[PDB]
Design an enzyme around this catalytic site. Structure first.
Site, PDB file in Angstrom:
ATOM      1  N   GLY A  38       0.786  -1.223   0.000  1.00 13.70           N
ATOM      2  CA  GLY A  38       0.000   0.000   0.000  1.00 13.70           C
ATOM      3  C   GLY A  38       0.822   1.280   0.000  1.00 13.70           C
ATOM      4  N   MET A 101      -9.247   8.942   3.963  1.00 13.08           N
ATOM      5  CA  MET A 101      -9.467   8.980   5.402  1.00 13.08           C
ATOM      6  C   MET A 101      -8.937  10.242   6.065  1.00 13.08           C
ATOM      7  N   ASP A 148      -4.711  -6.148  12.859  1.00 14.77           N
ATOM      8  CA  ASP A 148      -3.407  -5.626  12.532  1.00 14.77           C
ATOM      9  C   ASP A 148      -2.946  -4.448  13.432  1.00 14.77           C
ATOM     10  N   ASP A 166      -6.388   1.138   9.607  1.00 10.81           N
ATOM     11  CA  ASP A 166      -6.070  -0.095   8.886  1.00 10.81           C
ATOM     12  C   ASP A 166      -6.675  -1.370   9.507  1.00 10.81           C
ATOM     13  N   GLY A 168      -9.679  -4.412  10.069  1.00 13.98           N
ATOM     14  CA  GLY A 168     -10.336  -5.304   9.125  1.00 13.98           C
ATOM     15  C   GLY A 168     -11.839  -5.184   8.945  1.00 13.98           C
ATOM     16  N   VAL A 169     -12.287  -4.125   8.282  1.00 13.32           N
ATOM     17  CA  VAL A 169     -13.722  -3.862   8.169  1.00 13.32           C
ATOM     18  C   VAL A 169     -14.380  -4.567   6.986  1.00 13.32           C
ATOM     19  N   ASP A 175      -9.657 -10.840   2.379  1.00 16.87           N
ATOM     20  CA  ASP A 175      -9.463 -11.987   1.494  1.00 16.87           C
ATOM     21  C   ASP A 175      -8.550 -11.665   0.325  1.00 16.87           C
TER      22      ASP A 175
HETATM   23  N1  LIG Z   1      -4.488   9.108   7.558  1.00 17.17           N
HETATM   24  C1  LIG Z   1      -3.041   9.207   7.561  1.00 17.17           C
HETATM   25  N2  LIG Z   1      -2.558  10.427   7.808  1.00 17.17           N
HETATM   26  C2  LIG Z   1      -1.233  10.633   7.836  1.00 17.17           C
HETATM   27  N3  LIG Z   1      -0.376   9.596   7.611  1.00 17.17           N
HETATM   28  C3  LIG Z   1      -0.862   8.366   7.362  1.00 17.17           C
HETATM   29  C4  LIG Z   1      -2.180   8.160   7.334  1.00 17.17           C
HETATM   30  N4  LIG Z   1      -2.393   6.869   7.070  1.00 17.17           N
HETATM   31  C5  LIG Z   1      -1.194   6.267   6.931  1.00 17.17           C
HETATM   32  N5  LIG Z   1      -0.260   7.188   7.110  1.00 17.17           N
HETATM   33  C6  LIG Z   1       1.177   6.794   7.012  1.00 17.17           C
HETATM   34  O1  LIG Z   1       1.402   5.820   5.803  1.00 17.17           O
HETATM   35  C7  LIG Z   1       2.452   4.797   6.295  1.00 17.17           C
HETATM   36  C8  LIG Z   1       1.859   3.316   6.256  1.00 17.17           C
HETATM   37  O2  LIG Z   1       0.928   3.145   7.337  1.00 17.17           O
HETATM   38  P1  LIG Z   1      -0.215   1.946   7.218  1.00 17.17           P
HETATM   39  O3  LIG Z   1      -1.265   2.341   6.198  1.00 17.17           O
HETATM   40  O4  LIG Z   1      -0.858   1.743   8.547  1.00 17.17           O
HETATM   41  O5  LIG Z   1       0.506   0.576   6.747  1.00 17.17           O
HETATM   42  P2  LIG Z   1       1.685  -0.114   7.586  1.00 17.17           P
HETATM   43  O6  LIG Z   1       1.515   0.232   9.062  1.00 17.17           O
HETATM   44  O7  LIG Z   1       3.005   0.406   7.096  1.00 17.17           O
HETATM   45  O8  LIG Z   1       1.620  -1.750   7.388  1.00 17.17           O
HETATM   46  P3  LIG Z   1       2.317  -2.594   6.076  1.00 17.17           P
HETATM   47  O9  LIG Z   1       3.960  -2.623   6.257  1.00 17.17           O
HETATM   48  O10 LIG Z   1       1.931  -1.826   4.647  1.00 17.17           O
HETATM   49  S1  LIG Z   1       1.651  -4.410   6.032  1.00 17.17           S
HETATM   50  C9  LIG Z   1       2.738   5.132   7.494  1.00 17.17           C
HETATM   51  O11 LIG Z   1       3.979   5.854   7.511  1.00 17.17           O
HETATM   52  C10 LIG Z   1       1.507   6.119   8.019  1.00 17.17           C
HETATM   53  O12 LIG Z   1       1.990   7.022   9.109  1.00 17.17           O
HETATM   54  O1  LIG Z   2      -5.403  -0.627   5.157  1.00 15.95           O
HETATM   55  C1  LIG Z   2      -5.306  -1.796   5.331  1.00 15.95           C
HETATM   56  N1  LIG Z   2      -3.999  -2.433   5.338  1.00 15.95           N
HETATM   57  O2  LIG Z   2      -2.824  -1.689   5.142  1.00 15.95           O
HETATM   58  C2  LIG Z   2      -2.470  -1.759   3.789  1.00 15.95           C
HETATM   59  C3  LIG Z   2      -1.049  -2.318   3.680  1.00 15.95           C
HETATM   60  O3  LIG Z   2      -0.173  -1.260   3.419  1.00 15.95           O
HETATM   61  C4  LIG Z   2      -6.551  -2.651   5.532  1.00 15.95           C
HETATM   62  C5  LIG Z   2      -6.408  -3.987   5.791  1.00 15.95           C
HETATM   63  C6  LIG Z   2      -7.508  -4.771   5.964  1.00 15.95           C
HETATM   64  C7  LIG Z   2      -8.801  -4.189   5.875  1.00 15.95           C
HETATM   65  C8  LIG Z   2     -10.080  -4.734   6.007  1.00 15.95           C
HETATM   66  N2  LIG Z   2     -10.960  -3.748   5.830  1.00 15.95           N
HETATM   67  C9  LIG Z   2     -10.271  -2.607   5.591  1.00 15.95           C
HETATM   68  N3  LIG Z   2      -8.931  -2.904   5.627  1.00 15.95           N
HETATM   69  C10 LIG Z   2      -7.820  -2.089   5.454  1.00 15.95           C
HETATM   70  N4  LIG Z   2      -7.963  -0.668   5.161  1.00 15.95           N
HETATM   71  C11 LIG Z   2      -8.511   0.343   6.062  1.00 15.95           C
HETATM   72  C12 LIG Z   2      -9.342   0.028   7.129  1.00 15.95           C
HETATM   73  C13 LIG Z   2      -9.840   1.034   7.943  1.00 15.95           C
HETATM   74  C14 LIG Z   2      -9.510   2.360   7.700  1.00 15.95           C
HETATM   75  I1  LIG Z   2     -10.261   3.898   8.936  1.00 15.95           I
HETATM   76  C15 LIG Z   2      -8.683   2.673   6.633  1.00 15.95           C
HETATM   77  C16 LIG Z   2      -8.187   1.668   5.820  1.00 15.95           C
HETATM   78  F1  LIG Z   2      -7.374   1.979   4.772  1.00 15.95           F
HETATM   79 MG   LIG Z   3      -0.774  -1.438   7.201  1.00  8.09          MG
END
Ligand SMILES: Nc1ncnc2c1ncn2[C@@H]1O[C@H](COP(=O)(O)OP(=O)(O)OP(O)(O)=S)[C@@H](O)[C@H]1O
Ligand SMILES: O=C(NOCCO)c1ccc2cncn2c1Nc1ccc(I)cc1F
Ligand SMILES: [Mg+2]
Ligand SMILES: Nc1ncnc2c1ncn2[C@@H]1O[C@H](COP(=O)(O)OP(=O)(O)OP(O)(O)=S)[C@@H](O)[C@H]1O
Ligand SMILES: O=C(NOCCO)c1ccc2cncn2c1Nc1ccc(I)cc1F
Ligand SMILES: [Mg+2]
Lengths: 306, 229, 281, 229, 282, 306
Positions: A38, A101, A148, A166, A168-169, A175
């Protein structure tokens, strides 16, 4: 409470001020970060003027299931909590599901932990409350577990809010994400690693492990050696998982932390989920009673460390 | 029940039989209930593929009548056969228009669907004109012109420049201008205008219709490159 | 030399480093390193991938055509019309006849036999990297992880494990040796391909936990459920699949023995459309 | 006049209209005059095509109706389709046998022609027996058995081991043994014997039918390798 | 390296050095030097032919796969299912549509463009050496006379003129220069191929005197009768054919631009029979 | 005459002794010689026991024309002359028309001229008679001209017979041979090279040129330089043809040959076919009257030179 109410009010206001969401609607501001499958962008939704976080997750999926993912994400429109990151909408374009978001200008506790080195037990107290309330919120009002929990998925902001993200909604998105690339570490509970058990009890373990990582400022997996603990090639993921499953849980160092904190993480990290404290038990824990009652300029600590 | 009828028609469509299918769809429309989006394309496929099969017979019989160039019963028989298959052709299209202007044109809710039915009946009228030569030709041509002057207005009003239906109306109306009326300037100009328009909203192409949109697009380009020669 | 002077290539659409449909003496596929400052690690990656492709000329290896440096680092190969095996099997669920499925197996084996014969281990064989070109010819592609076996055990050094988990052999996952890849690891991947071919589904469909699969496969707990093969699957294929999938790598057959078997599987089955009545003239 | 009928049938064959071409030929045979070599092939092919079409129509339909494994209108009124196409199938074959045992089998101008018509009779009756499961099958199975044995005797007597017609009789009779009677041992023996005597006079292959002879040969080998496997 | 260790190749049938259908990781084509004592001239021939093939990787060049030395000298290439262009056009008289004929022209040009771009002159281009693989893809083969342009004019030396006369340019026939071959001579051959494609017949069908054709073409008296092009041949093709066939070699353009001209007569060249009505929903 | 009659009788009897002809019917003895488009083998026809010459000519041709070639070659069954090589039969197998003919153990005058260096004017006299009678035979009894007269196509044997071969009997075979590889020299008459004329007059020129080649023991075309004539990179074929067309015909050296011989070749080599002697005129030529009347152990000269 009043502050959180006002925040939710403003969120709903901007929501109503907007409507549908699509790829043309957006202008890129900056890249907030990336992960295993992502990418996240700070963006400006052109019609509404809103600044939001746009998460793109690459998926090659049938139209019938992409549409099922979108439809299932629409449940977030109702997810309103100050422990839960806000949801603006979701869509699919090109080769990628987009989740839009609440932008959190403080970042993830992962980002923070890098700049702060170690997070003070007193701040972690607020974080521990935030996580529990949010896990409770999800569980009771939306029938779902997080799946997670880890530092990169707890997001914090200027107003001192600690929110979960992030989770699991959409069951279909869960899946579709299973065909994935290999990670470099893991926060998965041992019982899940063994397919033995699956409940909120597993999200509790991950919070536990997170806390230890955030407290010590390193990695919960594989602990640290006698010398390394004095200061304060990476183990392959299969070895990490094998550790979690077959070795005793990590734990906090002896002196640097209050006995209440040490006891708290310990009941989160018990291998057997049955014997592991639950949300009700954790909520009335010595460490939580104390921290709840403490008053900390969390918002202040945050901006001062950035 | 309607669903048994539509499953019977869909099943017969999977078996490449277009007689039981057309009878089942006529029995559907005879109930006088308004169709969906899904139940309509089946009706157009039945009365369209069968019409095309009937046409191919007419084309090859007429070519075998313009390649003989003698005076005998071979081309005597051709005429006896051409008027036979032409009358068969006439019976099918009259059944279509009778099933169309009595349960569907007036009884419709979607304006896109209303424009569609106008495309279908107008195309059928154009096909009838593209074969009957005589006094009866004028009325069919007039009906086709009326259909063109009513679907095109609603297309220019409340449709997308990238929708399949507006593209199909432009395509059928252009080949109407080229074959029936033989004014390739006007039809060619309309095709050029369509190319200028259909290009504009190329970004606005959702998964519901990419294949149809690009298919009518390349068909339009092929007709253009044929006519500009 | 296979360096394409700058300017000649005309990059177009995108598909999925990163891959574009371009133009250079006809339709070609262009695979680019999007970025601007190529690290010396991305550089050796490129040098290595080109190095491997250069040694391939076979109808079942996707045709390397040349490389570019100046605009961005890029590899040019033949363009393919038609879909990946992944796409046929799990997306549009193409209803191949069993004789066709066997033939796809056969060709895939043919391409792999050819690579191993020149000492190339592909290391990323999977449905997606197997293209049914014009629906008739299997072309194995994506040599981004491909490597040539070094005669000397100390040249190896450290490489971070990457790849799709569903096709990774237990020994590769475990990653205990200096070099856990072997011809046999490629066979295992091909084993999973047989699985997709004879069953129509990916392995472990009930499990959606990524880390759990890595952990359970590496440990020996988890392995494909061979009972899910469709009933028209020749017994010889089921056996051959189970053999390619053996946990003890040395117990797996290599590609000649694979092609030695596969060829006979076709002779040990009536692969003639359906029946044979009166052929009307 | 006959020539108008054969031109009508040939013209309808050029228009890819099975039933159309297939009529005119019934009107030819109803005259009760003996055919040539040329006039036999056209009618034969038309009949074969119609047979195949009906066969698939019922077979595919029947299979789809038995592949729903539930209890509903799908395999109820929707499946009544099998008895419809089976009755259509029955009408065609009865028209064939009525056109066969009243103008053609009675007087033969060519004994190879007698082998031809008996091969057709075995083809039609065996197919009808396979189509009808119940009290009807016992009769038509033995009828095809007598017809193919009667053809096999004249094939073993006064035919070539490399002729198309004897090869076609061996092919149809072998698939009769495999599908109807389910004794693949005698079918294996029969096809192997016919294939080995087909090898003997490989040198004696004139431009009249090398393609037919080797085509039935490889078809025979394919059926053998299916049945022995 | 592309040397195939001895024993691996399994020679089978014959077709027409000499060419067999063999086996080496599937069906292949094996071209052998039948004899037993390879003269150093036959040796350099082999070395040179391999040298050229090694530099080719393109879908319209027949795929070189490797060579063998020990049993006999041999070149291994992909096997082709389907016939040569010669066979389609003059044997089974395949009734290609004009869009197909143009496309065959196009692909043949594509392969030639690719060779010239790497400085290879084929020197024996003709119908027989153009294969319609699976009836869909033109593969140019037989590189037995192929050569790479040397930067230096004195490396050439003496080579006895060989090749099929119907495709030889007047300057090649005359054989007055040290090196009369050029990219342009290849174009002329391709010119004769256009002729076969647009007419259905070889040139000079009224003349059966071999030496007379060599003499009259070299002299300028004889040249293909362009009036014999079939009536459906786009005017642009007729012109393009006459241009490739110019007697003054320099009067010819490069094949990249030749295909550019082949792309000219293509977009408006065809749209099939009649047109197409509303496309039925699948 | 009686000897020739006996030879013809033997040929016919042997022809009746054999029946059909096909590729399996043969066993290879040796290779009598080969060229750009044909190869000749001394073979044993297994059914009859006969030793014959088998000529294979590679042709890729339609069945309809191969069968027309065979059918047209069947006319040779009637071609019976002691100046014409005998014909046993013809067929097509694999990729090659086979012509089976009277084996001539003496070879072609081409082969002979190599071993003999120069052929004595007196032997050439017999050869000149043999050629004329044979050209006459072909012309009158079979309506055809040779087309291809040259040393390699005059064959000689132990019994002193000089016969012609490789003449143009099948018109279809002529046609099918036109798609050919380039030769290295030529005996073609200038008028044929210019498409100006086509008759027996052209076969006369070729005989003329042959004779000069056989007399001098080199090439009639491109006659040698002042020095080279004292002893007694090759010119490209286009240059040879251009010579024949644009230059004076070759001729015999001054002293070494009788004036009758010099005059004979000269009337065969006149550029303009009209002014060129014909078969009637050549037959009563001084050189022919003389040679006919001479008695030469030709058969003896032949075996002695091999
Ligand atoms: N709404 C948000 N606002 C500001 N920063 C965000 C936001 N969402 C994610 N980030 C940043 O994007 C990066 C990835 O965060 P996540 O989306 O939670 O995925 P993850 O924790 O890195 O898990 P993996 O390694 O992809 S499985 C992080 O550095 C977050 O701080
Ligand atoms: O985001 C996810 N995994 O991280 C990606 C790897 O980088 C993630 C994973 C599982 C999932 C099931 N239903 C939504 N799901 C996600 N998304 C998500 C959920 C709630 C919010 I608020 C914002 C989101 F983006
Ligand atoms: Mg993540
Ligand atoms: N019937 C025969 N008997 C004996 N020797 C023969 C016979 N036919 C051919 N040869 C030998 O084979 C060699 C080939 O000569 P031909 O068969 O006449 O072909 P050619 O004259 O070389 O025609 P070109 O120029 O090569 S296409 C000659 O040197 C002959 O000695
Ligand atoms: O033989 C030929 N050319 O030489 C081949 C190049 O090597 C040849 C050439 C033309 C021809 C026309 N009709 C027969 N023709 C030939 N054959 C032939 C004729 C008579 C006899 I007696 C024996 C023969 F073989
Ligand atoms: Mg000769």
């Amino acid at each position: 409470d009043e502050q959180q109410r006002k925040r939710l009010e403003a969120f709903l206001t901007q929501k109503q001020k907007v409507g549908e969401l699509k790829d043309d609607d957006f202008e890129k501001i900056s890249e907030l970060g990336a992960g295993n499958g992502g990418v996240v962008f700070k963006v400006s939704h052109k019609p509404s003027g809103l600044v939001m976080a746009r998460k793109l997750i690459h998926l090659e999926i049938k139209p019938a299931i992409r549409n099922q993912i979108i439809r299932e994400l629409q449940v977030l429109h109702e997810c309103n909590s100050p422990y839960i990151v806000g949801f603006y909408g979701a869509f699919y374009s090109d080769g990628e599901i987009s989740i839009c978001m609440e932008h959190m200008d403080g970042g993830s506790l992962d980002q923070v932990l890098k700049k702060a080195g170690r997070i003070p037990e007193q701040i972690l107290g607020k974080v521990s409350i935030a996580v529990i309330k949010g896990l409770t919120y999800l569980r009771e009002k939306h029938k779902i577990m997080h799946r997670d929990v880890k530092p990169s998925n707890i997001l914090v902001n200027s107003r001192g809010e600690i929110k979960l993200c992030d989770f699991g909604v959409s069951g279909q998105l869960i899946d579709a994400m299973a065909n994935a690339f290999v990670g470099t570490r893991s926060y998965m509970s041992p019982e899940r690693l063994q397919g033995t058990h699956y409940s909120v009890q597993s999200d509790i373990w991950s919070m536990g492990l997170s806390l230890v990582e955030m407290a010590v400022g390193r990695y919960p997996i594989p602990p640290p050696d006698a010398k390394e603990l004095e200061l304060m090639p990476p183990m392959a993921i299969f070895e990490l998982l094998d550790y979690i499953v077959n070795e005793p849980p990590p734990k906090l160092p002896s002196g640097v932390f209050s006995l209440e904190f040490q006891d708290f993480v310990n009941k989160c990290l018990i291998k057997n989920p049955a014997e592991r404290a639950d949300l009700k038990q954790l909520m009335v824990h010595a460490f939580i009673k104390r921290s709840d009652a403490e008053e900390v300029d969390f918002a202040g600590w945050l901006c001062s460390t950035i | 029940d309607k669903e048994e009828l539509v499953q019977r028609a869909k099943l017969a469509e999977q078996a490449e039989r277009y007689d039981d299918m057309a009878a089942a769809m006529k029995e559907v429309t005879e109930t006088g209930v308004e169709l969906s989006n899904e139940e309509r394309n089946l009706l157009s496929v039945a009365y369209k593929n069968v019409v095309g099969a009937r046409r191919s017979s007419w084309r090859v019989i007429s070519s075998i009548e313009q390649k003989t160039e003698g005076s005998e019963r071979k081309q005597q028989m051709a005429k006896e056969y051409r008027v036979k298959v032409e009358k068969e052709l006439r019976e099918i299209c009259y059944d279509v228009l009778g099933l169309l202007d009595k349960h569907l044109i007036p009884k419709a809710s979607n304006p896109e669907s209303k424009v569609f039915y106008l495309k279908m009946k107008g195309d059928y009228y154009r096909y009838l004109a593209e074969v009957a030569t005589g006094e009866t030709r004028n009325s069919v041509v007039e009906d086709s012109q009326k259909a063109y002057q009513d679907a095109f207005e609603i297309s220019k009003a409340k449709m997308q420049p990238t929708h399949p239906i507006r593209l199909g109306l432009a395509l059928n109306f252009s080949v109407f201008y080229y074959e029936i009326l033989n004014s390739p300037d006007k039809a060619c100009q309309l095709a050029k205008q369509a190319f200028d328009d259909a290009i504009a909203e190329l970004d606005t192409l959702n998964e519901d219709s990419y294949k149809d949109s690009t298919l009518i697009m390349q068909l339009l380009r092929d007709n253009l490159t044929l006519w500009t020669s | 030399d296979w360096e394409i002077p700058d300017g000649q290539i005309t990059v177009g659409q995108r598909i999925g480093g990163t891959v574009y449909k371009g133009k250079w003496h006809g339709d070609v596929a262009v695979k680019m390193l999007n970025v601007t400052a190529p690290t010396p690690q991305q550089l050796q990656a490129f040098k290595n991938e080109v190095g491997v492709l250069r040694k391939t000329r076979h109808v079942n290896i996707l045709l390397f055509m040349g490389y570019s440096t100046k605009p961005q680092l890029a590899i040019v190969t033949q363009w393919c019309e038609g879909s990946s095996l992944y796409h046929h099997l799990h997306i549009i669920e193409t209803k191949f006849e069993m004789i066709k499925l066997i033939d796809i197996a056969r060709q895939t084996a043919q391409g792999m036999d050819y690579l191993h014969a020149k000492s190339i281990i592909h290391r990323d064989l999977k449905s997606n990297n197997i293209f049914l070109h014009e629906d008739l010819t299997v072309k194995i592609g994506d040599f981004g992880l491909a490597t040539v076996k070094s005669r000397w055990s100390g040249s190896h050094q450290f490489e971070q494990l990457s790849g799709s988990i569903l096709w990774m052999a237990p020994e590769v996952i475990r990653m205990q040796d200096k070099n856990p890849y072997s011809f046999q690891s490629d066979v295992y991947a091909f084993g999973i391909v047989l699985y997709e071919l004879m069953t129509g589904q990916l392995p472990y469909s009930n499990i959606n936990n990524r880390d759990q699969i890595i952990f359970m496969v590496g440990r020996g707990y988890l392995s494909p459920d061979l009972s899910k093969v469709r009933s028209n699957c020749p017994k010889a294929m089921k056996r051959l699949m189970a053999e390619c999938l053996k946990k003890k790598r040395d117990e797996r057959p290599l590609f000649p023995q694979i092609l030695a078997s596969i060829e006979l599987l076709a002779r040990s089955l009536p692969k003639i459309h359906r029946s044979a009545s009166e052929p009307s003239l």
